[PDB]
């Protein structure tokens, strides 16, 4: 995942192809308990880096809870384009996970939203929490009472 946003051109394409193949041959990684947190963290890092005084140096950033680093382009347009492009795989994988096993992923999402560090900054944007609380809605299903009826 961390190489999906490389500064080059073909590197991200081959990384995307490898990720697609890996998720194809091992479907059980969708409902894992560590991928979602890491991808939300990197999305939040990119969202924070969206507006960080481009002329100021040091475009490097450190992903929390994982030893890695991310570089960003110079112009605003490229950064906006890359963050918008990355903002789609999140929804795709979230809906794919929600389609098959809703209970486990819903419990994981509930557990993620109960950390003290993010509560202080929650008054700001904190795009990860917004993404979670937006993805929870339009992928829900019917409960026990209304699971078997004919329209």
């Amino acid at each position: 995942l961390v190489n999906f946003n490389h500064i080059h051109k073909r590197i991200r394409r081959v990384a995307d192809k490898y990720l697609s193949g890996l998720v194809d041959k091992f479907p059980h990684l969708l409902w894992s308990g560590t991928v979602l947190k890491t991808m939300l963290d990197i999305l939040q890092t990119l969202s924070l880096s969206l507006s960080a005084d481009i002329h100021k140096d040091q475009p490097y950033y450190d992903i929390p809870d994982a030893p890695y680093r991310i570089t960003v382009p110079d112009t605003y347009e490229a950064r906006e384009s890359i963050v918008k492009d990355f903002a789609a795989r999140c929804g795709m994988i979230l809906q794919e996970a929600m389609k098959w096993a809703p209970t486990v992923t819903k419990s994981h999402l509930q557990e993620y939203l109960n950390k003290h560090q993010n509560w202080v900054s929650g008054l700001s944007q904190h795009t990860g929490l917004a993404m979670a609380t937006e993805s929870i809605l339009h992928f829900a299903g019917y409960n026990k009472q209304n699971t078997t009826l004919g329209a």
Binding site: I7, H55, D57, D74
Partner: protein, 144 residues
Amino acid sequence: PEAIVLDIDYKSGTPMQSKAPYLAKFKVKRCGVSELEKEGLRCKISWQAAIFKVGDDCRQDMLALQIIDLFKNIFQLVGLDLFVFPYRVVATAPGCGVIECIPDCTSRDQLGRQTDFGMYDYFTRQYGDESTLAFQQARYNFIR
């Protein structure tokens, strides 16, 4: 006038083309003005280069330097990002004066004679491809 000389390098003499103007180097200590004034009645170190001229006027350059320094002060006060280097110059005799030399002198004419190509090739060889980090900073300083 805000520094005290220490010694003289006895091997830096190099006359230039021209009238017999030569060049010399000095090792100097920077203290200040008031401390220098009070220490001149009782008895952070780098090197400096000096250029001497005979038979030439050095007043229009002084006026231009004053204007440049005033513009630099205005720009620094307003809060923008512009770069100008006001090298000092003082006249002391009719047709004779002392002119400071910027550190690490690199004339464009000499580089053009050496390369006979565009500056883009020179700075591509010196720093690297346009996608590197240093190239962006060099371009920003060039624009400034």
